[PDB]
Structure formats: structure tokens, C-alpha cells
Amino acid sequence: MEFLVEDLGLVPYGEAWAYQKRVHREVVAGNRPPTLLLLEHPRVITLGRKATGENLLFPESWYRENGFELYWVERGGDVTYHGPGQLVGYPIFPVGREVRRFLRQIEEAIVRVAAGYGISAYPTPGYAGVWVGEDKLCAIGVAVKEGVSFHGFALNVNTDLNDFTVIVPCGLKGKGVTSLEKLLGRKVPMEEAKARVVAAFAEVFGLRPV
Numbered sequence: 001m002e003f004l005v006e007d008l009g010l011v012p013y014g015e016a017w018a019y020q021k022r023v024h025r026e027v028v029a030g031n032r033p034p035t036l037l038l039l040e041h042p043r044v045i046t047l048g049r050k051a052t053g054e055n056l057l058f059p060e061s062w063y064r065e066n067g068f069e070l071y072w073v074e075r076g077g078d079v080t081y082h083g084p085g086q087l088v089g090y091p092i093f094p095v096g097r098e099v100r101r102f103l104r105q106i107e108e109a110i111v112r113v114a115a116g117y118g119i120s121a122y123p124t125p126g127y128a129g130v131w132v133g134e135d136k137l138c139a140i141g142v143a144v145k146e147g148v149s150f151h152g153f154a155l156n157v158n159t160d161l162n163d164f165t166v167i168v169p170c171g172l173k174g175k176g177v178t179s180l181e182k183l184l185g186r187k188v189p190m191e192e193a194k195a196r197v198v199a200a201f202a203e204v205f206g207l208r209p210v
């Protein structure tokens with residue numbers, strides 16, 4: 001009937017990852033409610049289950065020399081970027097076997113958040129994540145272990161979208177990437193985007209936020 005929200009603020013990817021795993025273990029054990037972590041990461045490139053070297057334009061060494069951290073991870077999808085201004089959410093929820101349903105619920109929540117800003121977004125029939133026309137507003141890539149999810153979504157609020165140009169997604173996709181800031185012509189407060197996400201998750205999952 002409830003989910004717990006934790007706002008971690010700005011946290012390094014590696015430490016936040018360790019925290020994900022600790023939270024996950026507690027949810028698996030039935031010792032913590034379904035938990036939504038909200039946060040930002042310092043500039044980082046991550047490479048998921050479908051990622052290869054072709055997803056990086058430059059060598060890995062270039063990224064680290066130019067202010068990115070870089071990690072290989074077990075979430076769905078290929079390469080992505082997280083950085084300041086991007087609202088990263090890790091719903092660590094007891095989803096059981098129904099992963100596709102869970103993805104659709106994350107998508108629905110993000111579509112609702114966009115609608116709150118007057119923005120028409122959609123999952124699309126063919127591309128992972130949530131899109132506004134031909135541009136990706138929110139990336140989504142999860143992992144599920146012992147029936148509990150981790151990783152999650154990355155909503156571009158005030159992201160430096162130029163940072164996506166150095167990575168090269170593979171497979172079926174639209175043309176570009178976008179953010180609330182780009183769509184609206186002004187920065188949107190991160191505190192507000194977090195609040196809107198919590199409300200959307202509450203509505204979609206039918207749970208009370210604590």
C-alpha cells in the first residue's frame with residue numbers, strides 16, 4: 001500500500017550503485033517497502049547488457065580524461081549518459097516475474113510527468129524509453145534479481161544534452177534527445193521534477209508515498 005521515496009541528491013555513480021544493492025537486498029528480504037531512489041549523478045557513461053565498444057565514439061580513456069566516469073552494468077539497453085540536471089530514478093520494487101508490465105508502468109509515470117508540463121510524450125511502439133516526437137526525453141533500463149528491480153530511468157530535466165553526442169546508441173531509435181528545459185525554453189527546478197515524479201508513481205502504481 002506504500003512506497004518509500006529517498007532523495008539522495010547528487011551522488012557518484014559507484015557509491016549510488018552500492019547503495020542500490022543494499023536497498024535491493026532489504027526489499028528482497030521483505031525488510032523495507034518498495035523504494036524509489038531519486039538522485040543525480042556526476043557525468044558518467046554506463047554500458048548495459050546490449051552495449052559494445054561500437055557504442056563509444058572515442059576510446060574509453062578519452063572519456064575519463066575528459067571528465068566522465070565510465071562503467072559496465074547489468075541493466076537492459078546499451079550505452080547511456082547521466083549528468084547534472086538529469087533526474088535519475090531507481091525504483092527498487094518487488095515486481096516478481098512481470099518485468100514488461102513494470103517497464104510500462106515506469107513509462108506511464110513519465111508520460112504523466114510530461115503531461116503535467118503540457119508536453120505530449122509517448123513510449124512509442126518501437127523504441128525503449130519515453131519520447132517527445134523524434135527525441136528521447138527519458139531513458140529506461142532496468143535489471144531484476146530475486147524478483148526485485150533495480151536501475152530504472154533517467155529523465156532529462158536540465159541536462160547538458162551536448163554530452164550525449166559522444167555516445168553512439170545501436171538499434172532502433174529516433175533522431176535525438178531532449179529535456180524539459182529544451183522543450184520549455186527554460187530550466188525547471190529539480191525539486192519540482194522530483195515531486196512530480198513521486199506523484200506520478202503514486203498514481204500509476206496505486207501506492208501512497210512516504
Ligand SMILES: CCCCCCCCO
Nearest residue numbers: 077078139140141152153
Ligand atoms: C537508469 C536509466 C538508464 C537507461 C539506459 C538506457 C539504454 C538503452 O539503450
